[PDB]
Design a protein around this motif. Structure first.
Motif, PDB file in Angstrom:
ATOM      1  N   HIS B   9     -72.826  54.288 -53.287  1.00 16.85           N
ATOM      2  CA  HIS B   9     -74.060  54.287 -53.953  1.00 16.85           C
ATOM      3  C   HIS B   9     -74.563  53.335 -53.779  1.00 16.85           C
ATOM      4  O   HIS B   9     -75.983  54.099 -53.613  1.00 16.85           O
ATOM      5  N   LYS B  10     -74.533  52.450 -54.132  1.00 16.75           N
ATOM      6  CA  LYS B  10     -75.299  51.528 -54.270  1.00 16.75           C
ATOM      7  C   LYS B  10     -74.936  50.236 -53.335  1.00 16.75           C
ATOM      8  O   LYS B  10     -73.777  49.844 -53.722  1.00 16.75           O
ATOM      9  N   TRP B  11     -75.105  49.190 -52.989  1.00 14.63           N
ATOM     10  CA  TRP B  11     -75.216  47.868 -52.301  1.00 14.63           C
ATOM     11  C   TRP B  11     -76.005  46.642 -52.677  1.00 14.63           C
ATOM     12  O   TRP B  11     -77.194  47.019 -51.207  1.00 14.63           O
ATOM     13  N   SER B  12     -76.201  46.237 -53.725  1.00 12.37           N
ATOM     14  CA  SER B  12     -76.859  44.429 -53.493  1.00 12.37           C
ATOM     15  C   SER B  12     -77.274  44.461 -52.040  1.00 12.37           C
ATOM     16  O   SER B  12     -78.775  44.037 -51.940  1.00 12.37           O
ATOM     17  N   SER B  13     -76.360  43.719 -51.283  1.00 14.10           N
ATOM     18  CA  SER B  13     -76.591  43.573 -49.849  1.00 14.10           C
ATOM     19  C   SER B  13     -75.191  43.292 -48.899  1.00 14.10           C
ATOM     20  O   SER B  13     -74.336  43.196 -49.375  1.00 14.10           O
ATOM     21  N   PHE B  14     -74.967  43.740 -47.969  1.00 11.07           N
ATOM     22  CA  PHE B  14     -74.274  43.141 -46.930  1.00 11.07           C
ATOM     23  C   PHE B  14     -74.606  42.517 -45.663  1.00 11.07           C
ATOM     24  O   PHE B  14     -76.057  42.630 -44.555  1.00 11.07           O
ATOM     25  N   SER B  15     -73.243  41.838 -45.026  1.00 12.40           N
ATOM     26  CA  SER B  15     -73.274  41.045 -43.722  1.00 12.40           C
ATOM     27  C   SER B  15     -73.365  41.668 -42.523  1.00 12.40           C
ATOM     28  O   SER B  15     -72.194  42.020 -42.683  1.00 12.40           O
ATOM     29  N   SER B  16     -74.596  42.211 -41.660  1.00 12.31           N
ATOM     30  CA  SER B  16     -74.055  42.525 -40.582  1.00 12.31           C
ATOM     31  C   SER B  16     -73.456  44.059 -40.060  1.00 12.31           C
ATOM     32  O   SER B  16     -73.828  44.632 -40.614  1.00 12.31           O
ATOM     33  N   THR B  17     -72.244  43.610 -39.211  1.00 11.70           N
ATOM     34  CA  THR B  17     -71.611  45.265 -38.817  1.00 11.70           C
ATOM     35  C   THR B  17     -70.885  45.481 -40.209  1.00 11.70           C
ATOM     36  O   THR B  17     -69.862  47.088 -40.560  1.00 11.70           O
ATOM     37  N   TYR B  18     -70.564  44.745 -41.196  1.00 14.87           N
ATOM     38  CA  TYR B  18     -69.964  44.631 -42.662  1.00 14.87           C
ATOM     39  C   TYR B  18     -70.303  45.414 -43.546  1.00 14.87           C
ATOM     40  O   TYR B  18     -70.518  45.771 -44.501  1.00 14.87           O
ATOM     41  N   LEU B  19     -70.505  47.663 -43.218  1.00 12.91           N
ATOM     42  CA  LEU B  19     -71.253  48.190 -43.708  1.00 12.91           C
ATOM     43  C   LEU B  19     -69.834  48.162 -44.859  1.00 12.91           C
ATOM     44  O   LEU B  19     -68.766  48.608 -44.907  1.00 12.91           O
ATOM     45  N   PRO B  20     -70.695  48.568 -46.050  1.00 13.58           N
ATOM     46  CA  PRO B  20     -69.870  48.515 -47.364  1.00 13.58           C
ATOM     47  C   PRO B  20     -69.022  50.333 -47.273  1.00 13.58           C
ATOM     48  O   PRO B  20     -68.310  50.203 -48.013  1.00 13.58           O
ATOM     49  N   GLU B  21     -69.595  51.292 -46.501  1.00 10.86           N
ATOM     50  CA  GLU B  21     -67.972  52.266 -46.048  1.00 10.86           C
ATOM     51  C   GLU B  21     -66.771  52.040 -45.720  1.00 10.86           C
ATOM     52  O   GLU B  21     -66.081  52.371 -45.753  1.00 10.86           O
ATOM     53  N   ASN B  22     -66.674  50.608 -44.796  1.00  8.81           N
ATOM     54  CA  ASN B  22     -65.903  50.219 -44.739  1.00  8.81           C
ATOM     55  C   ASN B  22     -64.677  50.008 -45.353  1.00  8.81           C
ATOM     56  O   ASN B  22     -63.559  50.387 -45.131  1.00  8.81           O
ATOM     57  N   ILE B  23     -65.347  49.709 -46.796  1.00  6.80           N
ATOM     58  CA  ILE B  23     -64.706  49.779 -48.463  1.00  6.80           C
ATOM     59  C   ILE B  23     -63.357  51.102 -48.470  1.00  6.80           C
ATOM     60  O   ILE B  23     -62.452  51.011 -48.800  1.00  6.80           O
ATOM     61  N   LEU B  24     -64.248  52.376 -47.852  1.00 10.02           N
ATOM     62  CA  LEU B  24     -63.083  53.664 -48.036  1.00 10.02           C
ATOM     63  C   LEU B  24     -61.822  53.171 -47.528  1.00 10.02           C
ATOM     64  O   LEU B  24     -60.868  54.157 -47.776  1.00 10.02           O
ATOM     65  N   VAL B  25     -61.521  52.786 -46.111  1.00 10.12           N
ATOM     66  CA  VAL B  25     -60.557  52.717 -45.475  1.00 10.12           C
ATOM     67  C   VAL B  25     -59.565  52.316 -45.119  1.00 10.12           C
ATOM     68  O   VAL B  25     -60.339  50.826 -45.013  1.00 10.12           O
ATOM     69  N   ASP B  26     -58.885  51.819 -45.728  1.00 11.15           N
ATOM     70  CA  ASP B  26     -57.503  50.894 -45.741  1.00 11.15           C
ATOM     71  C   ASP B  26     -57.371  50.634 -44.186  1.00 11.15           C
ATOM     72  O   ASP B  26     -56.638  51.561 -42.956  1.00 11.15           O
TER      73      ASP B  26
END
Lengths: 608, 604
Positions: B9-26
């Motif tokens: 839903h929201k992210w304070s900040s993210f660095s480079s390609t490490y997008l928050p969506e990666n958290i979804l997949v293990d």
């Protein structure tokens, strides 16, 4: 990584309804499905036996549905093909939660996998200090395939046999019972040591000619390691209102590097606590005389007064490159923040503005307290770290690179704190040294936003690969470092003065030893001399000092070792069962050589 | 439970390609399959939105295939159906290990279940302080079926509306805007105050009104208020006085209003003197100079004994003997009984171990239950003639049937109903609850900081804890009338109290000595401290004190309330003064019976 079945071989002790076999069932919903030691004391081991020998790689522990006091806060694991030959593999501690934790057990020695059959789990401390140890469920995973377990066991057996053969051969040589034993060892052709020691052994069977071989050892620096296994302070007095006019004034945070080929040192800039300095001075190692190149280089089209800057030199080009200028908000402005970079010639004594602003050319911005090193081969000036000066969140410049042969800037790495596969974290106050012999840009120390970073890593200038060595010596407020490519060492002096050294190959720090702060240190490897000048003493808030200290290494030089060996040989030559007595000198000399090629250091009589 | 689907839903900040969506997949094999904050600063967080509102119970955090510096050394989790306002659920830290972890989020208020839709994960510290925070994989588990989540939402909304309506009714009655406001309460069928409080308010809305609150005060409903609310007095005896002695024992009879002292070690030798000091007469009367002459025990120190008010009898068991004089015949578990009424001793058992009781122990604890006339002994290291020390477990002796029974043997394996034996602890009998509260103690040099209880009838053990720590020579006693356990510690004077009802440790009064004797009184509230040596071995302190607690009392509170009522009546000779006085008096009542705190204007 298939599961390895096991059976409870032995138990030090157990309590009622808590038999050890209960560890074979993973029933977290039952408190009675766990082992429980009789009492919490050092002797509470538990020996598990596998169905067949296997290389156990990971051990999985289970916990109750909820936190339990008897959980192993600290424990150790040992492995052994036999119940007696137990070797430690893991000494970690289980969590107090219910998460099924799996740990990795040491299963490789000298990059060689070793198998185990008996696993001894010895609890060290329960989470409840007064409570007994308890284990709920242990699952052993590893390589149980015989085609992978038998070969490594055979290799280890052969290695042990070779070690025994070497020990027996050395014992026979020491006693010289019969030379035929050598032929007995020649049937397998696996006991022969390095030919370097074989030449000395043949010379023993010539007495005075062995020195020649020693010369070769000096040529290859074989004894260097021994030299590494082994200081002198001197406050230099300048050679003759000349008390201070003949020498640089008191300053702190200046810059200086030592010209090994010219055996001279240079001193530029600095802060005396009152006003910034722009004077440029030179010093000679052949004498105590101090000469002032210029009382003010600003009027000479050179750098103006500056402090906390950096400057490096290239011996091959005899060049001096300087960058960086610490300032203040009252002084900082649009044109005062330009990343000026200057180059200087000692032969011609000409100061010129190499670049009015590196940031304009894509180079690093104006950074203070950064680090710089110029490659001796490619003449590449790599600049790393240093907070970027601005008129918000602190910003640290990444690892840049400059082309002396093309006058071009490039950005090797950025300030990436995400710890990527190849990432370098920018920092300030760090020590960065370019090991030319290994061609690696080592770096340690620093303070990322006053966090006092202790990570140490090396980056390859050519391979463009960064290797982490330690995610380390004592940390101080200000630390200076110097490189010893010939000995492959780094000497670090901490400020307000601890002195530490370590070997690149061994990778083991050690401490081998005038309170100065924000001082300057340079080093000459050929002369093995460190020069410590300037600094801040640390009653009033503001002071200044002008120290002239020099430190000489305590290690013996190769020439000294050769002279000692020659004297030892002459001691026996002057005198000239006799062969056995003469062999003592050869045995003593062999100790100087590195242990890698030297014969075994143990004797059968001592072992027996 | 089951996996709860969710989306970023929201992210304070993210660095480079490490997008928050990666958290979804293990995917531990891939380093890039993660999230990484732009930097390590206070404003760094992530927000996850569930597909539909659900009750999240546990959160599963993944890990890299190997230990990573960026792993969250510390972090916090918040839940809330609106991202605007969230409530904390977990505050822990991931270990720097590659094994997957799971934590139980705090999602329960009392026994209720609190659902959530938005989950905010805010990292605090990374294992490498310089390095920024990074999360690899997060899985949310719980109950997402509407049949359970929806009723919880209905209940929580109903509770919020109940609180709001209670507050508005409180505001109306404070301002007396209308007299029909009670109809609103009739809509909810719930009154902001308890029936007694409502009746008192109606009556007051003063000669007869005072009795209405006086009856409630006499009912004991103000005990919590009194607890919610220091008097050292060295008392000297009126030749007839005790002597220096350490390790002695003493008990207090409140009904008789006296203290019986016996035993003690004066450095030179043990003591057998039995004294009975009457508080009313302030006389340190002497009962005997040697109990053995009256068929009593010998002169020994470091023992324990209890007192029976209904029988005026003293039971003494356990004594300390030196290693040199330690012999099999001489280490018998002696057990004596003394009849203060007739001043005659009797030997209950020369060796309770043979009869089935505990062996000879020292530094143990004992208590009595006159309701069943049952004496319980716990703790005490068993003495053996000259291995691993052995500590006697819980026991029980029949004061009438003369029989020894073991209740819970020493069990240090932490079983469901296991009691760990200890020495130097404090074990107290709560008669109102007919249970034993055990706290403190030492075990083989390892100090025990675990507090628990054990019912003497239900035979059930309830662990209350896993803040007085490492407190040597700690003497504690129970006050069922105040339902408070009062403890006084000393050097190897700090004082503490424990409220059982609210299960709270309070610090009060933050001479130096150790191995002292303390007796607590619940009727007269007079507590006496005697003995305890403090340097030289022979130094000892035998000063007699009259320790007391400086705090209000039920009678004092009633008198203050009566005085306030009289002052208000005199002032009476706008009627909001009576309402203000009633509101002020309401503070005396407990929170549960009292109306909601605060006022609507305080929030508007």
């Amino acid at each position: 990584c298939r599961l390895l079945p096991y059976a409870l071989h032995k138990w030090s002790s157990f309590s009622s309804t808590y038999l050890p076999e209960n560890i074979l069932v993973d029933k977290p919903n039952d408190q009675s499905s766990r082992w429980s030691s009789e009492s919490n004391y050092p002797p509470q081991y538990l020996i598990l036996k596998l169905e067949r020998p296997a290389i156990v790689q990971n051990i999985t522990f289970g916990k109750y549905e909820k936190t339990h006091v008897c959980n192993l806060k600290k424990f150790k694991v040992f492995g052994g093909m036999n119940e007696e030959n137990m070797t430690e593999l893991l000494s970690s501690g289980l969590k107090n939660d219910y998460n099924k934790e799996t740990f990795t057990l040491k299963h490789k020695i000298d990059e060689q996998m070793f198998p185990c059959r008996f696993i001894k789990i010895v609890p060290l401390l329960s989470w409840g200090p007064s409570f007994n140890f308890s284990i709920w469920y242990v699952e052993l995973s590893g390589i149980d395939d015989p085609d992978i377990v038998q070969p490594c066991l055979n290799w280890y057996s052969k290695y042990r046999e070779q070690e025994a053969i070497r020990l027996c051969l050395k014992h026979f040589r020491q006693h010289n019972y019969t030379e035929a034993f050598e032929s007995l060892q020649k049937k397998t052709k696996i006991a022969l040591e390095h030919p370097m020691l074989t030449d000395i052994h043949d010379k023993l069977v010539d007495f005075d000619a062995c020195e020649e071989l020693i010369e070769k050892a000096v040529n290859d620096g074989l004894f260097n390691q021994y030299i590494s296994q082994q200081p002198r302070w001197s406050q230099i007095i300048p050679k003759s209102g000349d008390g201070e006019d003949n020498r640089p004034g008191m300053r702190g945070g200046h810059q200086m590097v030592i010209d090994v080929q010219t055996e001279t040192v240079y001193l530029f800039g600095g802060w005396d606590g009152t006003q910034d300095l722009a004077d440029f001075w030179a010093y000679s190692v052949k004498e105590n005389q101090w000469t002032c190149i210029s009382r003010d280089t600003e009027k000479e089209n050179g750098p103006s007064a500056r402090s906390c800057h950096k400057m490096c030199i290239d011996i091959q080009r005899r060049q001096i490159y300087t960058l960086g200028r610490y300032l203040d908000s009252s002084v900082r402005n649009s044109k005062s923040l330009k990343s000026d970079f200057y180059r200087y010639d000692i032969d011609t004594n000409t100061w010129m503005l190499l670049s009015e602003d590196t940031a304009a050319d894509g180079g690093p911005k104006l950074v203070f307290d950064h680090q710089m090193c110029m490659d001796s081969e490619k003449h590449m000036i790599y600049t790393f770290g240093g907070r970027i000066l601005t008129c918000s969140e602190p910003q640290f410049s990444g690892l840049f690179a400059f082309n002396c042969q093309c006058q071009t800037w490039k950005l090797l790495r950025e300030d990436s704190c995400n710890a990527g596969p190849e990432d370098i974290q920018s920092r300030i106050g760090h020590c960065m040294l370019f090991h030319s012999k290994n061609r690696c840009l080592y770096v340690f120390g620093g303070q990322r936003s006053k966090t006092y970073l202790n990570d140490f890593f090396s980056y390859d200038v050519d391979s463009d690969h960064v290797d982490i060595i330690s995610d380390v010596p004592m940390t101080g407020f200000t630390q200076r470092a110097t490189i010893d490519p010939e000995l492959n060492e780094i000497h670090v002096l901490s400020g307000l003065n601890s002195f530490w050294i370590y070997d690149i190959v061994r990778n083991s720090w050690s401490c081998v030893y005038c309170p100065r702060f924000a001082h300057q240190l340079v080093y000459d490897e050929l002369h093995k001399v460190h020069y410590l000048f300037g600094g801040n003493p640390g009653c009033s808030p503001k002071m200044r000092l002008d120290d002239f200290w020099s430190l000489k290494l305590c290690r013996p030089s190769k020439d000294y070792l050769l002279r000692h060996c020659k004297y030892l040989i002459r001691k026996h030559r002057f005198e000239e069962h006799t062969y056995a007595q003469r062999t003592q000198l050869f045995d003593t000399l062999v100790n100087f050589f590195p242990d890698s090629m030297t014969p075994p250091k143990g004797n059968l009589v001592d072992l027996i």
